[PDB]
Structures are given as structure tokens and as C-alpha cells.
Design a binder for this molecule. Structure first.
Ligand SMILES: *C(=O)N1C[C@H](NOS(=O)(=O)O)CC[C@H]1C(=O)NOCCN
Ligand SMILES: *C(=O)N1C[C@H](NOS(=O)(=O)O)CC[C@H]1C(=O)NOCCN
Ligand code: NI
Ligand code: NI
Lengths: 357, 357
């Protein structure tokens, strides 16, 4: 494995140095076997080292887990993607969500739901409900992609409602276990807190993510490199799971439209593979997150398999994560850092590694 | 026996409906007498009905047969569980299998051998050998249980080598006949193909298991409900076979360590009986098959008899099998289906039946 070791060292170390990244865990799945590389410090104050068991905040990578729950709800015939959103929450009946579908919410095409909830919306059922009740669209549903936590957040919350339980309960009791995961959480238990890395912000201050409205659905997962690769491996081989959970994962591997080179799935975003580093970086750039883009809608849902790269970026104030896999090559990659360093740099590491596998 | 009929019907029918199972064969050994219940279709195409003679793929239940061959090798003083793996295959000498025991391989504690051979390893001796020669442990031997086909596959293969014959020949010529079995096969003969059920996959496609490296050892057995109950009955009363085969069966009823509620034997996995449905389901859950678990090693091997439930689950892309017995209550159960439906559902059927006996 010294060959893989040399490749990963060469990819990681220059970027860790250039971005002053205290700690970074890599997990690679190659030819059906895991490989771990654990760099630096989980905490600068007490000098705890990064291991494959260190817990990191993965931020928006959480959307892939949220998509998995929604996938399950489909397999159980509890909801359908063409359902009107308000079908699954009576409180929204009569609002604009009578005419917005679950698919629109999942794929950020509801009509201009913002990146975040207004700063005034606290983590509170009534305030979240009221926000959606009063929300006035900027566009007609299904025409403009605008990356949005309130959009996919609602999708996840409605999936939970369709299954008749809180989102958090379903994730902790059903989803994580069904995926073969045991070190993956929405709220890190007391027993595992010693594994929780410290995050380091823009100003080098220690930071951990605080609560917010629909945080669990949008950006709330904490996990290790080892457990996140287990998730990637389930995505590569959904047959490691029970039938309905295999089907749930399959549902997150279906593309609905294109923006530039990117095909939008549930949570996952896909690309042809190979693709240039420059194009992959463009798909993961700040304008992709912050600008609205017209969508090019596929005539039918497209299976995101074969020679394709499926990926997701995620950040919190103190953390930067990236996950990617190539279904047709059985390659899987996880890079978790305890600094929020640029998306382009994460893609740089991933590309250098994947290019050499 | 309409009373047993009422119990079995009530346990089976709802689960068949819920999981869209085309065909399911139940065989129960109660107080030393067999009872068969045969539901639905062995093939949806030609409407052939399930009978106690229908052949199903039992997947990982095959491991109990593999363990029995190893049990025989032990009785014939051809190998010992403490033996270094490479003692029984000179080709592995100089590899990590110089420091891994037969017991490690049998009980999935070699140090991180994966669930499956990499898809790139073909059913070929050289490729299988090279895989093992190049393999590097994630963990120290004897410390972590990670369920693995290459692991127990090697155990069975090495047992065969110790006896001086191919694994397939030993199973067909010696093991199956010794157990009184005539409808149990690694490869179904032409004469019996009309009995071989069609399997039905995740997507409802007609599926039968295809060849793979060490498939015979890990998951390759096809058998009927009647023949598999005959095997269960041999397990309940080993003294019913020739002395060496009685001893071979006894060897598979010895526990070496615990993980949660489960005591690990050779092939067989054991629990106290009675135990809650919830706990029995956890023992047969996805995290059990996919997560590494630190083992709690027993001071000496524990005889798996009296008030205990010994069981094994098994699946292929198109089939789902479950077998269980309670030595101290002389109870035996076989449930074979031609759909790979969730482990928890199989346990639900079995628990409902066993609790009513
Ligand atoms: C997800 O991690 N997001 C969404 C967005 N950036 O998109 S990404 O480049 O695809 O990750 C803004 C940052 C981030 C969060 O919202 N993270 O949650 C912590 C602050 N709300
Ligand atoms: C055995 O049937 N296995 C082992 C594993 N699941 O464990 S079990 O729940 O104890 O059965 C994965 C699936 C399955 C197979 O490997 N089946 O053979 C076909 C794929 N190699
Ligand atoms: Ni594959
Ligand atoms: Ni008895």
C-alpha cells in the first residue's frame, strides 16, 4: 500500500500546508478494500491526533443522508416525488406549497428558497412553519436551481412526516443502522465526545456547529472517516443492505436535470468521469452555491452509475468535507478536515488521488 | 396438527405479502417429528408450486456445512483450530497468514478480511492465492470480528487441503451423504434442475447465483426445506450419525467469543433462549454484518447446548434463508424464500413460530 500512501501524501500535504489545516482524515475504498490516512491534529490545544475514528462535522454532505431517508419513504410507498409538499404537512395547505412538489424541494427548484433560513428563524417548529406559510417565490416551480438549506430541509422534514416520526428519530434508529453505521450521529453522544474534533474558523478560533432550524436535515451530521467510507461503500454496493435500504440508496442515484456539467440527484451531484479538474472545480464553485441557474431538465430520470463521479461538498464554520465515488470503477473517497478551506482545494486533493487510482 | 398450521400461517402469510415473496418453504422439527408448510410459487414464469422438495439457494447458511467439514477434519486429527493458516497451504508461507490461526479465519477475526472478495478476483486459484498473499490486516489478529466470505472461505478451503481433496469433492462425496442428505448440492445436477426455484431480485428480475471465488465455502449450497431440516435434526441429535460425524457436528456447537448478545461458533451463532425479538433482530442486523466489533473472548470454548438458540441467516440476490434450533427444547426450524427479504423479517417469522412452541 506504499504506492497508495505516496499518492495520498503527495496530494494531501501541500494542501494542508497551504490552507493551514490542523487535521485531515482520508479514507479510500479501492478494489473492495479500505485504506486510511490520518494527518495532523483533531485538537491543537490538547494535541489529540486524527485517526480514522475522529468525528468531524460534514456540513452539507448531510444532505446525502437526508436523501437516503426520503429514498426509504418512497420504497415504503409513504410519499412520491411528484407529491405536492402540503400533502404531507396540513399546516402548509393553502400556501404556495400546494403547488410545489417534493422533487422541487429536494433539488432546490421550488422558486428561490434562500441559501439559509432568515437569521430571525430560530430552531422552533412554529417559526419554521410560519416561514414556509408566508414564503413568496421569486420563480415558477421547477425552472431555477438555487442551492438551499430550507428547500432540502423541508424535503427531509416532509419525508419524516410521511413516515410518521421525527426526522432525528428516523435517522438515529432506522437510517444510520440500516447503512451499517454506528459512529454516525446528528448529536454526538456523551460517550463519543472525546472523539469529536475541534473546528478552526476563519480567525483560527476553536468552533463547533451551533443549533439552527432544520440543521439535522441540511448540515447536522458528525461522523468519522471510517464510518463515512462505510456509507460510500454502501452507495457503491447497495446490495450490502436489506432490500428497501438498497432501493433507498438507488433512489439517491437518479438524475433529474443538468446545470452546466453537473447532473442533480437527490443529495448527490454527478459528473462524467473522467472530467477535467477545472470543470469539476467549476461544478463545485461559489457561484454554483450562490447564483440561481436555469435547469436543463432530463426527459426521464437518469441512473447515476457507470463512468460517473458522484460527489458532495460540505462545510461548517470550522470544518470542510468532501466525498466522491465512481460507481463503474468501485472507487470511493472521503476527505474530512477541521478547517473550512476552499471547495476547489478539496477537489484538488480528490482529483489527484482519483486520477492515480 | 391444524394447531401448528394455524401458528405457521399467521407467522408467514403477512410477511410474504409485505415483502412480495413469491414462494416460501417452512420446515419445523417439533418433539422429533417433521412438519412442512409450502407457500406460493417456486417460479412465477411457469407457476411451479413450492413443495418441501423445492431447491432454494441458502447463501451464507452454507457456512454451517463448511464448518461441519472443518469439524470432520478436526476429528480426523488433520488440523487443529490453533494451527497457523499457512501450515495448510505452503503457498501462503511468508505472508501474514503465518500469524493468523484457523480459528481466526473461521470466526472472522483475522484482522479485517472484507465482506466479499474484490469484484476483480475471479474464481481462480492463482488470483485467490495472490489476493491472500497481498492482503494486509486492518486490525491485529483475534481482536475484531468483521463478517467475511474470504475469511471463512479460506477456513473451509484449508480444511479441504488438510484432508487432501478439493472442497467440492469432500462436500459431495463425504459430508452431505454422512448427514443423510441427498437433495443438497453445491452444483445442482441436471436430474434435479426441475426442482430449482427461480430467485427474484431487488428489482423483481429472475435471478440465480453465479460463480465466484470460494463460493462453495461461503454461500454456494442449494437445498430443500426437507433436506435442510434433516440437517437441523442431525444438529439436534449428533449421536444419530457415524461417530466421526457426530463429533464433527459437536465441533460446530462450541462458542469462542461474544459480541453483544451473540456467541460465535463455527458457522453457528448462538443466543440465550428465550430472548426478546428486538435483541435477536439486533444480533442478525446490518451493523452486525458490516461493522467491526471488539470481541469478548471466552476463557474456554463454551458448549452451545441447553436453553440456547443457534441460528444462521443467508441470502443471495434472489433468495433469503433462515435456520434455527433450540438444543434443550428439541426444536428445529427452516425458512427458505425465493426473494432476498430483510433479515429482521425472517427473524419475525421464526420468532413468531418458536414462541408458540
Ligand atoms: C453545506 O455545507 N452548506 C451549504 C452552502 N455551501 O454549499 S456547499 O459548498 O455545497 O457546501 C453554504 C455553507 C454550508 C452550510 O450551510 N453549512 O452549515 C453551517 C452554517 N449554516
Ligand atoms: C450470506 O448469505 N451473505 C453474507 C452477508 N450477509 O450476512 S448474513 O446476513 O449473515 O447473511 C452478505 C450477503 C450474503 C452473501 O454474500 N451472499 O452471496 C452472494 C454475494 N456474494
Ligand atoms: Ni461493484
Ligand atoms: Ni434431545
Amino acid at each position: 500500500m506504499d504506492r497508495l500512501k505516496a499518492l495520498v501524501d503527495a496530494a494531501v500535504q501541500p494542501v494542508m500546508k497551504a490552507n493551514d489545516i490542523p487535521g485531515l482524515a482520508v479514507a479510500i475504498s479501492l478494489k473492495g478494500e479500505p485504506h486510511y490516512f490520518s494527518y495532523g491534529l483533531a485538537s491543537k490545544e490538547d494535541g489529540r491526533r486524527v485517526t480514522p475514528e475522529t468525528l468531524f462535522e460534514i456540513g452539507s454532505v448531510s444532505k446525502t443522508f437526508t436523501a437516503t431517508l426520503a429514498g426509504y419513504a418512497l420504497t415504503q410507498d409513504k410519499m412520491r416525488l411528484d407529491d405536492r409538499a402540503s400533502q404531507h404537512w396540513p399546516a402548509l395547505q393553502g400556501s404556495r406549497f400546494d403547488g410545489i412538489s417534493l422533487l422541487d424541494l429536494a433539488t432546490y427548484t421550488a422558486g428561490g428558497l434562500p441559501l439559509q433560513f432568515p437569521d430571525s428563524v430560530q430552531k422552533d417548529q412554529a417559526q419554521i412553519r410560519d416561514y414556509y406559510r408566508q414564503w413568496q417565490p421569486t420563480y415558477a416551480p421547477g425552472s431555477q436551481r438555487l442551492y438551499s438549506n430550507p428547500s432540502i430541509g423541508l424535503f427531509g422534514y416532509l419525508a419524516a412526516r410521511s413516515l410518521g416520526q421525527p426526522f432525528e428519530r428516523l435517522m438515529e434508529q432506522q437510517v444510520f443502522p440500516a447503512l451499517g453505521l454506528e459512529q454516525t450521529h446528528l448529536d454526538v453522544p456523551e460517550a463519543a465526545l472525546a472523539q469529536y474534533a475541534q473546528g478552526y474558523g476563519k480567525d483560527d478560533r476553536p468552533l463547533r456547529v451551533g443549533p439552527g432550524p432544520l440543521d439535522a436535515e441540511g448540515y447536522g451530521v458528525k461522523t468519522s472517516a471510517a464510518d463515512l467510507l462505510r456509507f460510500v461503500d454502501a452507495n457503491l454496493h447497495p446490495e450490502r443492505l436489506d432490500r428497501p435500504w438498497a432501493q433507498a440508496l438507488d433512489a439517491t442515484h437518479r438524475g433529474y436535470y443538468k446545470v452546466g456539467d453537473m447532473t442533480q440527484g437527490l443529495g448527490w451531484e454527478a459528473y462524467d468521469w473522467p472530467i477535467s479538474l477545472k470543470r469539476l472545480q467549476a461544478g463545485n464553485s461559489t457561484p454554483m452555491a450562490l447564483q440561481p441557474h436555469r435547469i436543463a431538465r432530463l426527459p426521464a430520470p437518469q441512473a447515476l452509475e457507470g463512468q460517473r463521479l458522484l460527489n458532495k461538498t460540505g462545510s461548517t464554520n470550522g470544518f470542510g468535507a468532501y466525498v466522491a465515488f465512481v460507481p463503474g470503477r468501485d472507487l470511493g473517497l472521503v476527505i474530512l478536515a477541521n478547517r473550512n478551506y476552499p471547495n476547489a482545494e478539496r477537489v484538488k486533493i480528490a482529483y489527484a488521488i482519483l486520477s492515480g487510482l
